Design a binder for this molecule. Structure first.
Ligand SMILES: [Mg+2]
Ligand SMILES: [Mg+2]
Ligand SMILES: [Zn+2]
Lengths: 128, 136, 176, 37, 125
RNA sequence: ACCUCGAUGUCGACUCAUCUCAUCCUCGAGCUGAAGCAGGUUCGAAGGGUUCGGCUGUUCGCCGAUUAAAGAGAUACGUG
RNA sequence: UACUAAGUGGAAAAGGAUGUGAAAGUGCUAAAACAGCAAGGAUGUUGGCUUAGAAGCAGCCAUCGUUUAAAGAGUGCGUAA
């Protein structure tokens, strides 16, 4: 099993999965298929390795906390947590948590909120 | 380097250090102090070494207190000379330490940190030290 | 504590006749003897397919013996019923070995020929000319012969060349 | 082998024993062997 | 404390007194994702899967007045699945969960007050 | 300033050495930022050996060529 | 009547030590204790600063929330990532 952050719009120049016995030419078309709904983003993909050289892949969301910068309206958070540079409404956090649901292993939407609350505090952002 | 600025007389007599710790007997400022178990003369150089060791292993979180201070002077006749004909010049100050005097003490930092800092300092002093916690 | 641990002496062929200082353990593979010391403080009592040893006193030496002889009895029993073995991978470039009857030889980087007498009660076998498997009755003898074989070319961290115990992870060092 | 008068563990797994009336210490890293007090 | 242990036994005993299924499973070869995945598949909030120590299980079953159920929890790692109402689906869920994974044991349990064995798990599934 | 001033002849060189190990080589071993060659440090070890010359009264030293090595000291700074 | 395993007795320091005896407390423990062994030790994170190459590990910045019996923005080892 080797995870990699293959870009969603491009898949063709490369060899570190070739030592796995992966047939690169047959899977490059598949990477550009389902990912075409979210072009221009770097999508992480899990790669299981079956003995028979069959393979099944699982795409994931764009990395957490990147979205928090957008909701805050500020390009970068504080280097010091005590310095409350930004503030975000709890309703806006609901919009963010829903996007991450496929990646998040959180049991409930209410718990999914709590998981994002520990990420908002890393940026020093107030939860209002 | 700890040193008196100026004194009255330059060549005082030696001061004994075999007693039971008149003054400085108990910890007074921190929650952990260093206590000797055998009185001896410890000079300013060792004092500075212990102070800088504690400062370096302390960090910007707490404080450290020094209790003793080299008030008494000490003479040393120069090299290659017959005795007699006056008394030698003063060379190095020294703090008299009677057995059982708190002399170093720190505070406001984790407990194992007091233990490690005081043990680090104690290996620079000639006297056989002992860790003491502040009373309740 | 191992000292008071129930030894399950299965009555397959293991018979244990106790003397003043002899313990003769015999089985399908071969008789094994244990030389007891004078005035051993342990007390050896055996029940039907059950063996248990007890200490007369609580002194430190008796406490030690209570475990050492329990372990030795268990080891002798398992050896006489099953037999131990050690596995050697003699890996290298020109490194190889084979057996000439009672005497095993080795071929290493030595300009000198190496021969090693196989003692009594031990059996050696070479599946692959670079692969050795020593088989014996007592753990002590087979281990002694294994380290005797190993002494001629110890493993080194730079290259895997040398005599290596089976299931051993040797350290690695990179020299340019 | 480090013949040092004050032996103390350096690694976490460095265990100290007393073999032949001489305290020592053994670690998987052979750079920590000590002896003699 | 003695009180804390008694409360845990009493709570478990009371739960087993209203259950429609108690099924005993070895927790061997169960990954953290598998622990969350099996619980997630058990979807409907009427069922639980928990690794429970044998001594608690034994006292709880004993005080719930269960018998011959000791063998399921005897000398083995023992997670428990306990469901409510329609209990049959829970057994199929755990049976298809192992099969999807490398392995897992399914010792047996009680279904609607009736003992079943390990072999009978397949019948129910 | 304690024995010797009604005398204990003091530097160096030559001859003969003997002893200690805090080891220079030969001997055994551990570690290494020890690939090998070559090393560095440490442990064990006193059985044996430890060069020839220029300058200086010289020990000491500098230099030259060597050897496996050109050890550190003690013996009234061994030895009229 | 105890203690000593060192010829301690029958010389000596700073310091180190699961030597060993005694006493006073204190924790767990038979609804099972410690050690060993068999399983798992997860998610948001490949967070960002930055190094062809730093993404749990070249270092640095707050360094936490969630699922769960369990869990470190990873114990250390160990990777150009
Ligand atoms: Mg005369
Ligand atoms: Mg003459
Ligand atoms: Zn170590």
């Amino acid at each position: 099993i080797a995870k990699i952050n293959l870009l969603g719009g491009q898949a063709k120049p490369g060899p570190a999965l070739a030592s796995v016995g992966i047939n690169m030419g047959e899977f490059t078309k598949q990477f550009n298929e389902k990912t075409k709904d979210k072009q221009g983003e770097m999508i992480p993909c899990v790669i299981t390795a079956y003995n028979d050289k069959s393979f099944d892949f699982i795409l994931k969301t764009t990395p957490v906390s990147i979205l928090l910068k957008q909701a805050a309206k500020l390009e970068k958070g504080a280097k010091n947590a005590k310095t409350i540079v930004g503030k975000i409404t709890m309703a806006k956090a609901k919009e963010i948590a829903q996007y991450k649901l496929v990646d998040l292993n959180a049991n409930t939407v209410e718990a999914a909120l709590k998981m994002v609350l520990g990420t908002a505090k890393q940026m020093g952002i107030e939860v209002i | 380097m700890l040193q008196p600025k100026r004194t009255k007389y330059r060549k005082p007599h030696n001061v004994s250090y075999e007693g039971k710790a008149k003054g400085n007997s108990y910890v007074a400022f921190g929650e952990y102090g260093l206590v000797a178990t055998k009185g001896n003369w410890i000079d300013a150089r060792a004092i500075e070494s212990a102070r800088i060791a504690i400062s370096k292993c302390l960090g910007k979180t707490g404080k450290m207190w020094i209790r003793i201070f080299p008030h008494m002077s000490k003479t040393k006749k120069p090299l290659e000379v017959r005795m007699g004909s006056g008394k030698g010049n003063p060379e190095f100050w020294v703090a008299v330490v009677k057995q059982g005097t708190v002399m170093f003490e720190v505070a406001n930092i984790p407990e194992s940190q007091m233990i490690k800092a005081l043990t680090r300092a104690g290996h620079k002093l000639p006297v056989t030290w002992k860790i003491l916690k502040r009373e309740e | 504590k191992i000292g008071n641990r129930t030894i399950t002496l299965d009555p397959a062929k293991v018979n244990l006749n106790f003397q003043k200082d002899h313990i003769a353990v015999k089985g399908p593979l071969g008789q094994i003897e244990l030389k007891l010391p004078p005035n051993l403080p342990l007390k050896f009592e055996l029940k039907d397919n059950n063996l248990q040893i007890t200490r007369n006193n609580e002194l430190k030496q008796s406490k030690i013996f209570h475990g050492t002889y329990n372990a030795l009895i268990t080891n002798a029993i398992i050896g006489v019923t099953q037999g131990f073995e050690k596995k050697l991978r003699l890996v290298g470039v020109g490194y190889r070995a084979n057996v000439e009857g009672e005497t095993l030889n080795l071929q290493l980087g030595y300009s000198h020929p190496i021969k090693e007498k196989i003692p009594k009660g031990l059996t050696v076998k070479v599946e692959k000319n670079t692969e050795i498997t020593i088989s014996g009755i007592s753990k002590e003898l087979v281990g002694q012969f294994a380290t005797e074989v190993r002494k001629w070319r110890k493993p080194e961290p730079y290259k895997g060349k040398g005599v290596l115990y089976f299931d051993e992870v040797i350290v690695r060092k990179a020299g340019k | 082998m480090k013949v040092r008068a004050s032996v103390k563990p350096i690694c976490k797994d460095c265990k100290i024993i007393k073999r032949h009336q001489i305290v020592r210490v053994i670690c998987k890293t052979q750079k920590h062997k000590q002896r003699q007090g | 404390a003695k009180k804390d242990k008694a409360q845990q036994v009493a709570d478990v005993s009371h739960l087993l007194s209203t259950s429609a299924g108690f099924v005993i499973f070895d927790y061997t070869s169960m990954s953290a994702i598998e622990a969350t995945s099996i619980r997630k598949k058990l979807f409907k909030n009427g069922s639980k899967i928990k690794v429970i120590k044998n001594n608690i299980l034994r006292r709880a079953l004993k005080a719930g007045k269960f018998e011959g159920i000791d063998e399921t929890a005897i000398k083995g790692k023992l997670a428990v699945a306990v469901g409510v109402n329609e209990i049959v689906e829970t057994l199929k869920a755990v049976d298809g969960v192992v099969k999807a994974k490398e392995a897992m044991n399914f010792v047996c349990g009680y279904f609607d007050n009736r003992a079943f064995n390990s072999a009978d798990l397949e019948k129910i599934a």
